[PDB]
Scaffold this motif. Structure first.
Motif, PDB file in Angstrom:
ATOM      1  N   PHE A 170       5.022 -22.115  39.426  1.00  0.00           N
ATOM      2  CA  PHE A 170       4.470 -21.167  38.419  1.00  0.00           C
ATOM      3  C   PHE A 170       5.390 -21.118  37.198  1.00  0.00           C
ATOM      4  N   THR A 171       6.682 -21.440  37.349  1.00  0.00           N
ATOM      5  CA  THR A 171       7.672 -21.354  36.229  1.00  0.00           C
ATOM      6  C   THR A 171       8.314 -22.708  35.857  1.00  0.00           C
ATOM      7  N   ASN A 172       8.327 -23.730  36.719  1.00  0.00           N
ATOM      8  CA  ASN A 172       9.188 -24.918  36.536  1.00  0.00           C
ATOM      9  C   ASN A 172       8.467 -26.048  35.810  1.00  0.00           C
ATOM     10  N   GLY A 173       7.262 -25.803  35.355  1.00  0.00           N
ATOM     11  CA  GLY A 173       6.508 -26.781  34.546  1.00  0.00           C
ATOM     12  C   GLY A 173       5.488 -27.538  35.370  1.00  0.00           C
TER      13      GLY A 173
END
Ligand code: NAP
Ligand code: NAP
Ligand code: NAP
Ligand code: GLC
Ligand code: GLC
Ligand code: GLC
Lengths: 295, 295, 295
Positions: free
Chosen positions: A190-193
């Motif tokens: 969800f955050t690391n691309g």
């Protein structure tokens, strides 16, 4: 049940049934396989997720026993299969490795078609990114399988964005999914691309182990479980429905793959679609999952 | 020996000879430099890898002693040089830094041409990514050097994909390589997107320290060494040939750079091209390198 | 003072004044707010950086007290505001979360316009990347605000390159900045691809906490402080001017945002523009910041 068009050639059920564990069920009889499939169909879950290697290379033959004994059943379902992993099982491979060669892909698909008793699969995935991949060879082999009609659509699994980009660069057909681990226990994408990449390309991910493979229930995730149970009680569903609804709420149109072999749990699999998951609730659960306030 | 066309202006030998350590050899005589080069040529290794800073800014002058004493020898070889690092050596820089200015690049190339006794180099690399880079200034200076004929082609070294993308965005000429550490001791690029990026762009990497700078042989890598020795004995070559063959097997067309100053080891450098490295063997060695089964 | 055109619709001062802490000043009187703004204008610093959430949702009303009591003052400044964070402050949110919905963005901008007593802001930023973002909804809402004239330009804050790419893919308007932490205490963006991405796109970052929020002065950064003081003494400015000059030296055209509430420090804020920061000095300070020699 919501359907999701991955292409002009492939529509899945929004919730998919996974058969990783079909061989772990002490009952692998045709009737028991049919019962699981019929329980999915009763809730509009039509997509079955398989792989060549599952069940020490027996899980597709176990499904095949069900299908072969039930004329017309295969035509009610979508079959997803995978290839690319070679697992030791005297003639066994000496080391676990990847094989994304045209020859191995073709041999894996032919065995899949013979074991399941069908002339086509709906979706073929490269199972893992291969550090030795020849994207030109693999791309040309995947395109050729779509052209043959043996495979309706192709995608990948566990690929990083750079792996997805490299294979897509060598292919005519669009890769229609990336099957990746996503759950309240596995939030990095969800955050690391990894999810942003697919969301930008309008590619639905398929989420594997959406309940952590059962780990969610282990007693190690008491704060997350307390919140899922409270929301479940409010809305008249179980904690599992809320955990799956958490994935379904995402705008990237995640397709969760459930793995239960329990007919009582299959019967309520679609309860996730009844849950109202507002933005604040999604962040309540996300905050419990990451163990701290958002930045 | 396989050749590899990096562009319409630059063809290298598939194995390159590196001169990082040419000044570490207690013998830096013209005859000894010529002997190393002649031993490479005898096996079709024609590309020599240099840098301005090597040998405390003496390694290109040491090569120049060999070339200047052997008319026609420079025209048998490709010379790769690098610029961008400024290393302390009263007039010395006060801190190790990068300098990718047009002025420094031009001064570095002119000194390289004077020290090696030639009017051109075959390939110029920016030696390290520069956190202070002005891509427009550096790009325009690299393009101008290609236009002048002093430099046949340009590339980079140790660049991340984003560094490569930024400098290429400011340049007419295509960057023809990225010279990066790759070996059975340094495997991160096969999974972390650094190699995928170059493979997608059809850019051959050059692999530096392909034997770990000698670390492979230290006694710290007993499992990898046991496997390289067994495969070497099977195919009638040494462990080094197998370790280099491991890189040559990759579909991204890696160009390994060997660094030995030992004339006996230079003489067998091309044995790597005799090795058959099947997919299972590549994964055997990869599994030993990463210290665990693939996922 | 240098100006910097972010678009055809938005020009900022090269140094920006930040009001995160305007409510931390025990004096929030209109006269004291006007004094801070007038001290900025006296040095050509015209851009004021705000957010909806600042000062427990009071900082924009505190600025509004200054502006509303000084006819013509708002027309001398650029106002940057932000939305997307919902912070607990009975009617308070139950969990800190992000809200990038069209409705929340619109409500946040209308409250910003009422609190500051103006019909427009110069720049609106999405405050944090939102793991639940619907880029199509957020993109369409940002475009609509530019079209309305209520917002002259839009950008983002704390976005990773993939977050920036995803939202820009859903928008007509160009995102004109990414407001990110950059300082001699926060150097990761110079190497990890975050700055390279913006430099390649010709997007100026805005640097928040360029003095570490005061941490630079804590006594934990004695080596960096010794060097800033020596350079300051050589050039007749303070350590702060040199620390800001370090950011201004970068070719990516960083726009630092200072946060002091001290009128004596505001008065010398522009001294950073008087500093000569050569490449070797930039690397001296960078080497002290990363605690080791460059590679
Ligand atoms: N592409 C890949 O690399 C990859 C990797 C993993 C899996 N997959 C796919 O993803 C599918 C789903 O993954 P998964 O099997 O890990 O699914 P899952 O839904 O995360 O976990 C299923 C497991 O949890 C147990 N479980 C379910 N509800 C429970 C409850 N209320 N209390 C306690 N235990 C409970 C199930 O046991 P019962 O049978 O007793 O209910 C089963 O062992 C697989 O079947 C496969 O199709 C793909
Ligand atoms: N772009 C960059 O940043 C960068 C960084 C590093 C290097 N490079 C380039 O890459 C080249 C190769 O790197 P490298 O020099 O580290 O090469 P390498 O081939 O990995 O290692 C060469 C070193 O290993 C020793 N060695 C070789 N075979 C051995 C054996 N069988 N047993 C024990 N020791 C053995 C050699 O000693 P002997 O002489 O005694 O054989 C020498 O010290 C350099 O010359 C340079 O051109 C570039
Ligand atoms: N987008 C985001 O997520 C984000 C996050 C943070 C901030 N921002 C923006 O960036 C702006 C700047 O960040 P910041 O406020 O952290 O600014 P800063 O300039 O890094 O730090 C300002 C702080 O340092 C103190 N200070 C300044 N000079 C000092 C000195 N010589 N000795 C000791 N202490 C000193 C100030 O105290 P005095 O008042 O006593 O001088 C103040 O507390 C904010 O105002 C806001 O506009 C945005
Ligand atoms: O902008 C300044 C800061 O304000 C608040 O503390 C927000 O939570 C934080 O995310 C933001 O970076
Ligand atoms: O698909 C389920 C899993 O099957 C096997 O365990 C594979 O090794 C693993 O890589 C895969 O993720
Ligand atoms: O090229 C060989 C090496 O030479 C010097 O040691 C440089 O500092 C280093 O960055 C480089 O990688």
């Amino acid at each position: 049940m919501q359907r999701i068009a991955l292409s002009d050639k492939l529509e899945l059920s929004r919730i998919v049934y996974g058969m990783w564990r079909i061989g772990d069920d002490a009952d692998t009889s045709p009737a028991h396989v049919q019962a699981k499939i019929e329980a999915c169909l009763a809730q509009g879950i039509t997509t079955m997720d398989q792989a060549d290697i599952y069940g020490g290379y027996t899980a597709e033959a176990i499904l095949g026993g069900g299908l072969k004994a039930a004329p017309g059943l295969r035509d009610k379902i979508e079959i997803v299969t995978k290839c690319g992993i070679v697992a030791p099982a005297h003639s066994s491979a000496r080391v676990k490795h990847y094989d994304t060669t045209a020859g191995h892909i073709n041999v894996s698909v032919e065995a899949s078609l013979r074991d399941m008793g069908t002339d086509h699969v709906d979706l073929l995935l490269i199972h893992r990114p291969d550090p030795l991949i020849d994207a030109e060879e693999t791309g040309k082999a995947l395109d050729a399988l779509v052209a043959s009609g043996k495979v309706k659509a192709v995608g990948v699994s566990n690929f990083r964005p750079w792996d997805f980009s490299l294979l897509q660069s060598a292919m005519s057909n669009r890769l229609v999914t990336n099957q990746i681990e996503m759950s309240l226990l596995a939030t990095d994408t969800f955050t690391n691309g990894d999810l942003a990449y697919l969301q930008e390309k309008r590619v639905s991910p398929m989420a594997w182990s959406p309940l952590g493979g059962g780990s969610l229930f282990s007693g190690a995730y008491g704060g997350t479980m307390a919140a899922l149970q409270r929301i479940g009680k409010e809305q008249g569903v179980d904690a599992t429905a809320v955990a799956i609804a958490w994935l379904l709420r995402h705008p990237a149109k995640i397709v969760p793959v459930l793995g239960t072999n329990n007919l009582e749990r299959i019967r309520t699999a679609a309860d996730a679609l009844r849950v109202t998951m507002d933005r604040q609730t999604w962040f309540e659960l996300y905050t419990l999952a990451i163990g701290k306030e958002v930045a």
